[PDB]
Ligand binder design. Structure first.
Ligand SMILES: [Cl-]
Ligand SMILES: [Cl-]
Ligand SMILES: [Cl-]
Ligand SMILES: [Cl-]
Ligand SMILES: [Cl-]
Ligand SMILES: [Mn+2]
Ligand SMILES: [Mn+2]
Ligand SMILES: [Mn+2]
Ligand SMILES: [Mn+2]
Lengths: 1345, 9
């Protein structure tokens, strides 16, 4: 009763606690070993930064039971506005002691006012300064401290390991993890503190700096004592948003902390942090759903972007089944980047808006439910730092503003991103409500959230551990596992970092957690470490535990290599995931830790693995894994040699292939995979299997695991995209097996015969095997082939249907809703002149059909599986979607047929048959099935910008062209600095963002989308908005786009008010006519706008809506008029054969021969004669414009100045190119024509026009000697550092030829004096080799200025 | 003519 201490007891220990404060005196374990707590009278409580010392009258004590005691603390300071009652609970269980603040009463406050209003006198922070919950002393045997801080740098360890001596002097030294050891015992301190502090290396905030342990020294008699305390906790924190508005937000959780007292837990004869770390796992926080991390063998990204629907949800399900077959059903983790709105970096932050063009919530749920049966987990990429006007969440309160009241702008790509006010988004309840929108759609089907960019200070200048803890909680609360971008981010709750798992990003300073303490504790719970990437060195030179190496094949960054993806899983990820099924128990001889980098007391042993690195791991069933390094010397070949043993038996040996792709290795393995792909439980003894991989290929012998020792044979299968193949029966002798393996080819070994994994291709897709993933077999089992020709499944990467000759491939459609409208589109690449068709039939009769001739438009969709960098045939891909529209019949009998009509040897490629509900009905036909009219308001587009297809103005790219969406007033002209409307009519339009001065086609129609019949006339009209005069133009062409062979009509400015465009088109003789939008060489008028206003303004954009194409009546002609028009055309051009190209003459002869076929056919009608006449009239207007083009190149070479001005007014192209790609400006600079050049530049000449050799007019002006031209060109916008085909800049050419006045003008205008050509020479070196010492000294003084 | 190599001596 009068004793000032009490005793709490477990079967493992007894603890003495003080009655006057929640303090521990000492811990005595059953074996009599003692660990101190706080031996001194320290009674400090910190509230809001103020230390208050408690007296006897301020604390009441109550012993609840032998395992619990409650304290009531009166914490008061009148001057500092503090009057609180803190209730503290101390509990014990086994070797653990917990200290929890169970109640905080504020006498100076009524609470947080509604809507997170400011709470006056709020208790914001709380801590117990120098509480010393556990402590060690310099007088104890082997007294030491081990701490961990965050390091994303592969060369800089995050740990510290040192002896606790009399000289040890620390005060609130903060660590993420801290362990003390001494006198046979070890202990770590766990706290849920959101404090941010000291770190070794991290490129971002976002919870990277969470340090929860405070170490402090004090004198305890003759010895120095190092004690561990929790870092401060946040309770009711007051925060400010970007508008200066203040809020008080409640605690993420009440304050909690604990210790777990360990002895020699790993039984190695030493007591250090590793023993304390094993015990620490019993009290530490565990990220939500981290128990599934070892199962996630196949990580990857499935991408969608810019309305294209490159990867609809039911195609992602098929790719899951493809990877399930190739890995024998190992678990997967698919990150849906672009799951929402129009795709990746569209619709942020509308989390609940699942992409309608991908199949919406219904298809996403089917994909997730069915995918889970194959062990596949799904998660979505979200953004809580940047938003777009189109997002319904976009509001003025959501907008982040700067100290001046302006928008805090983000990235402009498809649309202009605007930063989100992170503090408003949290304190208002907005973010949590958008996550709830998503929760309603996905239910409990979705596994994880991938939070992009969090920590890069885009949402606020803070994004601390308190904000990240609250962010992870609202995510975890919906049943979602937390994953994020940056390698160092979110130490507390993230189970994956993209910049840790994808080792190619960021470089050696910006990777995953480089800590032995952190990886020892949590390797099995996260893919947030450093894997093999030797060029980074240090932690990245063959880590013994491996580390996730992530690749992709579904469009992310153009990644499409399926074979490289599978090869990579087996090279690094199968062994990394195997190692994660065990927990580290011992880790000695770490070469990265030395006395120089603060780790003098790091855990060593010369009796283990020759004093070289070794790690021991164990599971809860006592299975032991030992991973050993061949040598600790990085100059030895054995540094990268690793052996893995499972229960004393070698299961892996050798050097892995460098994770950076730089060197193949020699590693082989025979890994026992004992777990299912769901919760990771042990599969039944007979279902147990081994994975075999041999890097170089060859024959290796292995000892099978114990439970296989009595088998007399095993079954070995080669794994392919079709599953288990080439079954071999291999004999077992003395429990050993010999395996012959091809290089980098996976095999799976079973005890007996194994069945194939059951795969029903394309579930929910209305057709079986829509993506041609079923091998050659699919053309017998699923699709029916008929005809004299040939049908085959071709392509080693993304398999396709390839047709040759006359053949039909058909399949019955299932699960259609009778009477509903459907669109059916299929990707087609036709290399034959004969038609390739898609047809839907019902009971023998055709409901819908469409055809394409030879494909004329290459595919430039980076995230798409068949873009022109993927080699469909001949190093190119012309894949474009071909549509048919039909109403599902009441009979329920519908069949799709893909066919090649012609009997020639050329190929037709088809892939991805997609049947989707669609309400589009804008196409009207004539009786002959030809086009009567096509209208499109873009309100019912199944995907992409149909009837247009994206062109090559940016190469294979995540094209800055997409379907723009309405969200007034934010998307309309007038909001902020925005001058253009995103949408013209309805909710959707086609938008081009900032593609000015490309001098090429932006997008175009193609014959399979809209077919223009030879000779027929069409009226084309549309509504548009264009940011400047003449930046974009209407282009009309025939066949594959070629510069010079298209008709251009510049479009006038329509900025904020919708313009109307209309023109006529006569179809070319080959049925391949098209129209589109072209980016000219004309500079936009930015109207004095600066910075982000240049992009957000709309000055460089182009919006198109309400497209209307209609066949019009042309004036009727007789056969006589048609024939007379032939004589008239032949009279104008037959003589000009010499004046024409050998291909221009063939195009003229082609048209003429074809028009004569119309006139002279037996039974020709007035329609044929009118078509023949209209074709010749179009041929006339073409040959006439081509003549004015070569007459302009003739008048710019010889310098007839007045001919040049009249020719451009008559129609001649200012950018006419000769056979060497030379424009009239290239001829007016090489010949010196000042007046010609200026008028040309005003007209719209490309100042940076490159010829066949990349030579610009500025290159020619500098290489000849015209200073008048140089000043004009530089004023117009000539690129002073433009490089030709040999890397030569104009400065290189001026110095090489001998032009002193030129080198000075170029240098003044910004010429890079240290620019290297292809032979490494700079402009200075070119002067020395030619005898221009006077030029050389001018460039030498410029280089060192 | 092709001006690329004319420019170069
Ligand atoms: Cl070496
Ligand atoms: Cl090697
Ligand atoms: Cl072709
Ligand atoms: Cl459509
Ligand atoms: Cl070269
Ligand atoms: Mn030990
Ligand atoms: Mn395919
Ligand atoms: Mn519209
Ligand atoms: Mn948009």
């Amino acid at each position: 009763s009068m004793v000032a201490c009490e005793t709490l007891k477990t079967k493992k220990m007894e603890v003495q606690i003080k009655k006057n404060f929640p303090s521990v005196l000492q811990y005595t374990m059953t074996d009599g070993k003692v660990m101190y707590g706080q031996s001194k009278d320290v009674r400090t409580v910190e509230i809001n930064g103020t230390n208050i010392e408690l007296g006897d009258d301020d604390v009441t004590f109550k012993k609840v039971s032998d395992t619990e005691a409650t304290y009531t603390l009166k914490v008061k300071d009148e001057a500092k506005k503090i009057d609180a009652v803190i209730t503290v609970q101390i509990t014990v269980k086994a070797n653990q002691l917990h200290l929890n603040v169970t109640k905080i009463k504020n006498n100076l406050s009524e609470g947080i006012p509604e809507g997170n209003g400011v709470e006056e006198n709020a208790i914001q922070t709380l801590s117990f300064p120098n509480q010393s919950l556990v402590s060690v002393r310099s007088s104890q045997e082997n007294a030491q401290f081990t701490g961990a801080r965050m390091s994303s740098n592969t060369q800089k360890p995050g740990d510290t390991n040192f002896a606790v001596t009399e000289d040890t002097n620390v005060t609130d030294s903060d660590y993420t993890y801290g362990f003390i050891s001494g006198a046979g015992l070890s202990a770590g301190l766990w706290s849920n503190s959101e404090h941010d502090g000291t770190y070794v290396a991290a490129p971002v905030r976002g919870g990277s700096q969470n340090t929860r342990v405070y170490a402090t020294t004090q004198q305890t008699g003759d010895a120095t004592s190092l004690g561990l305390a929790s870092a401060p906790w946040y309770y009711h924190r007051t925060v400010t948003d970007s508008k200066g508005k203040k809020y008080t937000v409640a605690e993420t959780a009440l304050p909690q902390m604990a210790v777990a007292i360990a002895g020699d837990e790993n039984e190695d004869g030493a007591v250090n942090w590793q023993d304390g770390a094993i015990a620490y796992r019993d009290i530490m926080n565990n990220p939500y759903k981290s128990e599934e991390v070892p199962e996630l063998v196949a990580w990857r990204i499935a991408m969608n972007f810019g309305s294209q629907a490159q990867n609809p949800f039911l195609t992602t399900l098929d790719n899951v089944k493809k990877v399930a077959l190739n890995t024998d059903g190992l678990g997967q983790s698919v990150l849906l980047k672009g799951y929402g709105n129009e795709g990746h970096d569209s619709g942020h932050p509308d989390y609940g808006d699942i992409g309608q063009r991908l199949g919406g919530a219904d298809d996403m749920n089917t994909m997730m439910e069915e995918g889970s049966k194959y062990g596949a987990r799904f998660g979505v990429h979200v953004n809580a730092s940047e938003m777009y006007p189109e997002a319904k969440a976009f509001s003025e309160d959501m907008v982040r503003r700067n100290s001046a009241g302006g928008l805090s702008y983000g990235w402009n790509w498809l649309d202009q991103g605007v930063g989100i006010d992170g503090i408003y988004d949290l304190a208002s309840g907005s973010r949590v409500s958008r996550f709830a929108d998503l929760s309603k759609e996905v239910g409990d089907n979705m596994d994880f959230i991938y939070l992009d960019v969090w920590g890069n200070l885009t949402s606020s200048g803070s994004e601390d551990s308190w904000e990240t803890r609250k962010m992870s909680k609202m995510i975890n609360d919906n049943g979602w596992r937390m994953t994020t971008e940056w390698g160092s981010g979110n130490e507390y709750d993230s189970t994956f970092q993209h910049w840790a798992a994808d080792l190619t990003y960021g470089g050696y300073t910006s990777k995953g957690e480089n800590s032995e303490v952190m990886r020892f504790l949590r390797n099995h719970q996260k893919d947030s470490w450093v894997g093999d990437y030797p060029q980074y060195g240090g932690a990245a030179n063959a880590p013994l535990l491996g580390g996730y190496n992530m690749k992709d094949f579904e469009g992310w960054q153009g990644r499409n290599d399926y074979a490289a993806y599978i090869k990579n899983l087996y090279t690094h990820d199968v062994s990394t995931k195997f190692i994660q099924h065990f927990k580290v128990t011992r880790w000695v001889n770490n070469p990265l830790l030395t006395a120089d980098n603060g780790n003098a007391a790091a855990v060593s042993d010369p009796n283990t693995n020759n004093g070289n690195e070794q790690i021991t791991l164990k599971d809860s069933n006592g299975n032991v894994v030992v991973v050993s390094r061949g040598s600790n010397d990085t100059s030895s070949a054995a540094y990268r040699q690793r052996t893995i043993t499972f229960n004393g038996v070698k299961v892996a040996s050798g050097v892995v292939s460098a994770g950076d792709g730089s060197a193949t290795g020699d590693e082989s393995y025979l890994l026992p995979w004992m777990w299912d792909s769901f919760t990771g439980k042990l599969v039944k003894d007979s279902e147990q299997k081994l994975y075999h991989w041999n890097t170089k290929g060859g024959t290796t012998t292995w000892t099978l695991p114990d439970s296989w020792k009595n088998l007399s044979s095993v079954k070995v299968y080669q794994l392919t995209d079709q599953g288990k193949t080439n079954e071999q029966t291999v004999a077992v002798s003395g429990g050993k097996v010999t395996l012959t393996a091809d290089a980098e080819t996976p095999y799976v070994v079973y005890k007996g015969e194994a069945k194939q994994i059951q795969v029903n291709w394309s579930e929910g897709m209305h057709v079986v095997d829509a993506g041609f993933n079923g091998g050659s077999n699919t053309l017998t089992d699923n699709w029916t082939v008929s005809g004299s020709g040939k049908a085959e499944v071709e392509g080693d990467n993304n398999a396709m249907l390839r047709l040759t000759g006359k053949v039909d491939v058909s399949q019955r459609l299932t699960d259609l809703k009778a009477g509903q409208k459907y669109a059916l589109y299929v990707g087609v690449d036709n290399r034959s002149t004969g038609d390739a068709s898609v047809t839907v039939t019902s009971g023998g009769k055709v409901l819908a059909t469409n055809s394409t001739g030879k494909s004329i438009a290459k595919n430039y969709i980076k995230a798409y599986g068949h873009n022109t960098n993927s080699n469909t045939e001949n190093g190119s891909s012309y894949f474009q979607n071909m549509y048919v529209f039909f109403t599902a019949p009441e009979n329920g009998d519908a069949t799709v047929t893909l066919s090649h009509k012609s009997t020639d040897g050329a190929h037709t490629y088809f892939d991805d048959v997609r049947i989707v509900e669609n309400q589009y009905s804008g196409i009207t036909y004539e009786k002959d099935g030809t086009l009567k009219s096509l209208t499109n308001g873009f309100e019912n587009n199944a995907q992409g910008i149909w009837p247009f297809v994206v062109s090559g103005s940016e190469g294979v790219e995540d094209n800055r062209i997409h379907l723009s969406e309405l969200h007034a007033p934010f998307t309309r002209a007038g909001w902020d600095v925005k001058k253009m409307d995103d949408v013209l009519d309805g909710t959707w339009s086609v938008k081009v963002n900032g593609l000015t001065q490309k001098g090429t086609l932006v997008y175009q129609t193609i014959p399979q989308n809209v077919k223009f019949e030879a000779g027929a006339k069409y009226k084309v009209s549309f509504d548009y908005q264009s940011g400047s005069d003449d930046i974009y133009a209407i282009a009309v062409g025939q066949g594959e786009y070629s510069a010079g062979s298209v008709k251009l009509t510049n479009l006038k400015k329509a900025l904020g008010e919708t313009g109307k465009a209309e023109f006529e088109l006569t179809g070319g003789v080959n049925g391949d006519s098209w129209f589109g939008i072209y980016s000219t060489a004309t500079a936009p008028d930015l109207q004095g706008s600066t910075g982000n206003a240049q992009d957000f303004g709309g000055y460089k954009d182009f919006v198109l809506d309400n497209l209307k194409i209609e066949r019009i009546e042309s004036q009727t002609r007789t056969k006589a008029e048609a024939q007379d028009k032939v004589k008239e055309i032949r009279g104008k051009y037959d003589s000009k054969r010499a004046e024409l190209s050998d291909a221009a003459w063939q195009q003229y002869q082609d048209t003429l021969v074809k028009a004569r076929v119309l006139i002279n056919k037996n039974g020709a009608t007035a329609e044929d004669f009118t078509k023949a006449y209209d074709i010749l009239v179009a041929l006339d207007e073409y040959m006439k414009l081509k003549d004015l083009d070569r007459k302009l190149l003739e008048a710019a070479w010889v310098g007839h100045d007045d001919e040049v001005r009249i020719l451009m007014a008559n129609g001649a192209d200012v950018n006419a190119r000769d056979m060497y790609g030379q424009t009239p400006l290239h001829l007016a600079a090489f010949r010196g024509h000042l007046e010609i050049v200026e008028v040309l530049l005003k007209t719209g000449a490309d100042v940076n026009a490159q010829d066949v050799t990349g030579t610009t007019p500025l290159h020619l002006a500098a290489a000849v000697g015209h200073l008048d031209i140089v000043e004009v060109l530089l004023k117009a916008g000539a690129d002073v550092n433009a490089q030709d085909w040999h890397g030569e800049t104009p400065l290189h050419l001026a110095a090489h030829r001998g032009h002193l006045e030129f080198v000075e003008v170029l240098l003044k205008h910004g010429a890079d004096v240290n620019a290297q050509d292809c032979f490494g020479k700079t402009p200075f070196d070119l002067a020395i080799d030619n005898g221009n010492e006077d030029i050389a000294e001018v460039l030498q003084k410029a280089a060192k200025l | 003519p092709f001006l690329a190599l004319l420019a170069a001596x």
